[PDB]
């Protein structure tokens, strides 16, 4: 679990969005596993606007942060789960690092701000949904 709170927006994994997120929907994209909802309170986070390929992510299944080198956002095949059929997920970045079911929502940050959230993983890989291209989150 986990979310990004920026301005009057809450960014979550689309597959973990609540009834309240869907009732206050701003934007969602199944191909990216993202959903953004509106908030009444002002958010605590700031978004990176950069091309960093290294950073640090929070891994809830270890209660720890780990440094990672990750690929540029791209279209990656993701196997079927209870949440989605087998499909290509877009704007996904992969890295070597621990992740297991329940780690989705952990933030990846570089020195410039929030880069994205955990969205996939397994067998010593961790995948992050990029948010750096969503320029409207800042306005």
| Binding site members for Zn(2+) | 50, 52, 110, 112
**Candidates 33-41, 73-81, 106-114, 118-126; binding stretch for Zn ion (CB under 5 A):** 106-114
Backbone φ and ψ for 20, nearest 5 degrees, come out as -65, -40
User: Is 15 among the residues known to form the active site?
Assistant: yes
Calpha distance 42→80 (Å, rounded)? 36
Residue list 16-55, contact with ligand A1B4Z (CB under 6 A): 33
Which residue number places its CB atom closest to ligand A1B4Z? 121
Paired with 29 in beta bridges are 34
65 touches 59 (CB < 8 A) = yes
Residue 104 binding ligand A1B4Z, by CB under 6 A: yes
Q: In the 8-state DSSP scheme, what is residue 50? A: S
User: Is 133 among the residues known to form the active site?
Assistant: no
Q: Which does 4 bind (CB under 5 to 8 A by kind): ligand A1B4Z, Zn ion, none?
A: none
Q: Alpha helices, DSSP H only, in 1-139? A: 19-23
Catalytic residues: 15, 33, 104
């Amino acid at each position: 679990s986990g979310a990004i709170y920026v301005g009057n927006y809450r960014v979550v994994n689309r597959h973990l969005a609540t009834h309240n997120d869907w009732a206050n929907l701003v934007w969602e994209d199944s191909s990216r596993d993202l959903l953004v909802s509106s908030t009444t309170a002002q958010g605590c986070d700031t978004i990176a606007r950069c091309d960093c390929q290294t950073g640090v992510y929070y891994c809830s299944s270890r209660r720890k942060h780990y440094p990672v080198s990750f690929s540029k956002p791209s279209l990656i095949f993701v196997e079927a789960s209870e949440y989605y059929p087998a499909r290509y997920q877009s704007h996904l970045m992969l890295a070597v690092g621990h992740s297991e079911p329940g780690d989705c929502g952990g933030i990846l940050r570089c020195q410039h701000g929030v880069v994205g959230i955990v969205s996939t993983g397994g067998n010593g890989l961790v995948g992050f949904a990029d948010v750096r291209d969503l320029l409207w989150l800042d306005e």
